[PDB]
Amino acid sequence: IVGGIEARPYEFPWQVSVRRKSSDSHFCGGSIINDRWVVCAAHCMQGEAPALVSLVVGEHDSSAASTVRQTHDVDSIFVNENYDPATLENDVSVIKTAVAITFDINVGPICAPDPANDYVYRKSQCSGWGTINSGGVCCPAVLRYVTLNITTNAFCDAVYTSDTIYDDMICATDNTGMTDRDSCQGDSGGPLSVKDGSGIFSLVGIVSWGIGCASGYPGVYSRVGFHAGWITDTITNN
């Protein structure tokens, strides 16, 4: 996360740290949607083997000992069959745990978005243990987050003078030049959310790709509303 701040302990209870099991190395974020499923990005899971991945929930400061932290083995991984590694279209996946995730005040799922809402200009949040600068060293110990503005796809597509922003994508950035706030390396697969008047959070995007980080280009995310049907069918049939 670039231009953001430290999250308070378990401020975003659905946040997941996806790691290489043998090295406990965080490489992507994720979002809990129920006690057996986590939403992530396709580019994070493509080619991964269930036995070599660990999902860590209830995390905050990865460098501290914790009684809240839960480490889960992965049962199966589902990458969107239409994922295009070249265009980044359909950059979505869902991961199933071997056992049920324990839910409490510190760990819980995030809500699904309303597919019939593009969230244009809504204030949003993005959290993760990604680098704080493009090219920075991965990864900061304490969970961070930043608030962003969800742009129109046309605007985002206009800024990316050499790349296409598809309808299944959603972008978010700051209102001050796109050089202050953004998600970065390590935040991928993580959540881009919005909250209602009651403080209830909904998953509207999945950290996907971008040029640099707060380097003049908006961050690009996989539009969860667009892939909502796929996520529902996948977690319901597996």
Binding site: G4, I5, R8, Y10, E11, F12, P13, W14, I33, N34, D35, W37, F103, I105, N106, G108, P109, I110, C111, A112, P113, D114, P115, K123, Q125, S127, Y145, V146, T147, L148, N149, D174, N175, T176, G177, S193, K195, G199, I200, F201, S202, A228, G229, I231, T232, I235
Partner: peptide, 27 residues
């Protein structure tokens, strides 16, 4: 409406009433 992926209870709840309220300047 949003699909219900978690029929077991309420989704999207944070213990902090002001969770994720970091300011976002208008520019």
């Amino acid at each position: 409406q949003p699909p219900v992926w978690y029929p077991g209870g309420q989704c999207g709840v944070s213990q902090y009433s002001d969770a994720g309220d970091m300011e976002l300047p208008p520019g």
